[PDB]
Amino acid sequence: QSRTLLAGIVQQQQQLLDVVKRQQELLRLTVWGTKNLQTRVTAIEKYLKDQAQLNAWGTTVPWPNASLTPKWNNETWQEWERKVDFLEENITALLEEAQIQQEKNMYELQKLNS
Amino acid sequence: QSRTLLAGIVQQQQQLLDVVKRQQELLRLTVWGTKNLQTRVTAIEKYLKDQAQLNAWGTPKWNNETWQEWERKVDFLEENITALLEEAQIQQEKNMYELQKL
Amino acid sequence: QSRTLLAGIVQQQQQLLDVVKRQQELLRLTVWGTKNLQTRVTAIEKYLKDQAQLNAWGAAFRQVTTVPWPNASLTPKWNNETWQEWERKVDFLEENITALLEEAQIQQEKNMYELQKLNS
Ligand SMILES: [Cl-]
Ligand SMILES: [Cl-]
Ligand SMILES: [Cl-]
Ligand SMILES: [Hg+2]
Ligand SMILES: [Hg+2]
């Protein structure tokens, strides 16, 4: 009498798991893009600071940022990398455990009538 | 009877809730990084325009407003999802008690 | 009499679906931002390379002071192809997740239907 609902609940759990797995894939691609851009923006900032210094040796608009800025940005994003890489590893683990629990639940649903 | 499957369903809901909490922390970090890059690219664009004008002597609006909108939206959603997650956790605790009664 | 629990579980599935739908909206906005930045950084890279080459040329010939743009010749094409692929993948995922969310919504309604009948 409740079997139908139970089956649909277990089914919905698979559906939600599928959604969050595919959301994790899209999040990973977004994280990749962010990393790729960070390296390219840092290169541009480095380039422009080098060109400003060369000009200075020679007017030419002083590269405004502070001396310390490259170090700071490097340290901040290294922290960012460590946090994001940990979260990606943890979510992968949690997703794997959810898949196992999904299988356990299906097994139990199948054992249900007999 | 169906108790064991039920236990397993309740547990998988906590597992799903845990994934989405972690995914929100990852998404917040990614949003931070987007913001940080947006500010740095804006700075670079401004610098290059300044330099161009100086050189020639011898866009920003639009972008700012569009990113203002983006910020409002992002910010709304971050708040909203945090509250939804906390509600989910509370309902999770209720479902665990009810299973308990079982 | 597992009813209250079952209603609690169906309600929590609703809450989880609501969370993942809002998380997708946040993800879509983040993707948008990533794309906007990619377009602008690519524009900057192109401008700087062009400027560097034009200045190198004029200093050689002066025909109506710059640090050479260091990247390899082929980098912009490689960048473009890599992000075209990124885009293709992001687009697949956005279509797929939207489809999975609609399926989830359908199954939530079927579950609610069944919950309303078993207790009645
Ligand atoms: Cl700098
Ligand atoms: Cl987009
Ligand atoms: Cl290049
Ligand atoms: Hg940490
Ligand atoms: Hg718990």
Side-chain angles (χ1 to χ4, degrees), chain C residues 45-46 49 69 71-73 75-76:
Chain C
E45 288 169 332
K46 177 176 165 50
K49 186 173 185 197
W69 179 250
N71 280 352
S73 211
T75 312

Side-chain angles (χ1 to χ4, degrees), chain A residues 12 23 29 36 40 47 51, chain C residues 20 24 45 67 86 104 108:
Chain A
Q12 177 72 326
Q23 279 176 328
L29 284 158
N36 179 267
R40 286 162 62 202
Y47 175 81
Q51 162 77 237
Chain C
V20 295
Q24 187 65 14
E45 288 169 332
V67 173
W86 178 92
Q108 187 61 29

Side-chain angles (χ1 to χ4, degrees), chain A residues 21 24 28 85-99, chain B residues 19 22-23:
Chain A
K21 288 179 177 192
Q24 186 65 11
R28 288 169 60 171
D85 296 345
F86 172 68
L87 282 161
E88 291 187 340
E89 279 192 337
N90 188 234
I91 291 159
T92 296
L94 288 177
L95 288 171
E96 288 204 7
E97 277 160 32
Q99 182 61 45
Chain B
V19 173
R22 291 312 207 182
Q23 290 182 307

